[PDB]
Amino acid sequence: AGKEKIRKKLKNEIKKKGRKAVIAW
Structure with a gap:
């Protein structure tokens, strides 16, 4: 998902x- 991608x-x-x-940054 992408809102609650967990x-x-x-x-x-x-x-x-x-x-x-910083898990993307």
């Missing part, structure tokens, strides 16, 4: 942005 879910796909997406 990470956008904000696991870390965008933790917060992974940090600043």
Whole structure:
């Protein structure tokens, strides 16, 4: 998915942005 990608879910796909997406950055 892409909203709750189980990470956008904000696991870390965008933790917060992974940090600043630093899971993408």
